[PDB]
Design a binder for this molecule. Structure first.
Ligand SMILES: COC(=O)/C(O)=C/C(=O)C1(Cc2ccc(Cl)cc2)CCN(Cc2ccccc2C)CC1
Ligand SMILES: [Mn+2]
Ligand SMILES: [Mn+2]
Length: 180
């Protein structure tokens, strides 16, 4: 895959702490976007990765008088419109649940009020892949009802290989460790 060869190239070339730190964040972000692609592929839903709430609202409800509402500036990864319900989706890749809970409460606080004013029935849904075990957790009762089985075949091994190589290269680097 070109993406792996691209990270390998940057790891091969990297010399400085600040450039190393950005490779690390990029790998973690690509792991997340890789899961998002595979997730939507397994579900037969269109793939998206960060859609402004404004554009979600105009997509499902183009005749809304949008100028009457204060739509918070927020970009969930994706959404599904079942013709009756709007499911807000965010992907996660994590061994723990803490990041899931933070996004859940943020979207519940930021998205749900205005969707209720407008009158679109909405549910926040979060799908987390444990990157070690490949196990899929879901929050969102309606999402679980419409997808009782999630036929994903995930492999995150290459993302660990790449990050491990970078962390080995800067094993001593104090400045670098100060940004994990
Ligand atoms: C994992 O789910 C999220 O946290 C999420 O989708 C975050 C994002 O979309 C942003 C890009 C990103 C994605 C994944 C990872 Cl690992 C790191 C960074 C882009 C938008 N900004 C909003 C502030 C945060 C990061
Ligand atoms: Mn996102
Ligand atoms: Mn996400």
């Amino acid at each position: 895959d070109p993406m792996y060869e691209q990270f390998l190239q940057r790891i091969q070339a990297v010399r400085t702490a600040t450039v190393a730190k950005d490779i690390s964040a990029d790998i973690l972000e690509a792991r997340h976007d890789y899961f998002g692609r595979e997730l939507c592929r397994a579900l037969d839903i269109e793939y998206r990765n960060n859609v402004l709430l404004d554009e979600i609202i105009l997509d499902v409800y183009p005749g809304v008088n949008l100028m009457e509402y204060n739509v918070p500036h927020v970009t969930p990864d994706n959404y599904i419109w079942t013709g009756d319900m709007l499911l807000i989706l965010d992907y996660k890749v994590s061994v723990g649940h803490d990041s899931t809970e933070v996004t859940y409460k943020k979207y519940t606080t930021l998205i749900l009020p205005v969707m209720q004013e407008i009158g679109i029935n909405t549910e926040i849904c979060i799908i987390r892949a444990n990157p070690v075990t490949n196990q899929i957790s879901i929050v969102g009762e309606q999402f679980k009802r419409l997808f009782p089985t999630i036929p994903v075949e995930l492999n995150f091994a290459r993302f660990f290989e790449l990050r491990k190589m970078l962390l080995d290269k800067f094993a001593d680097d104090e400045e670098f460790l100060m940004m994990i």
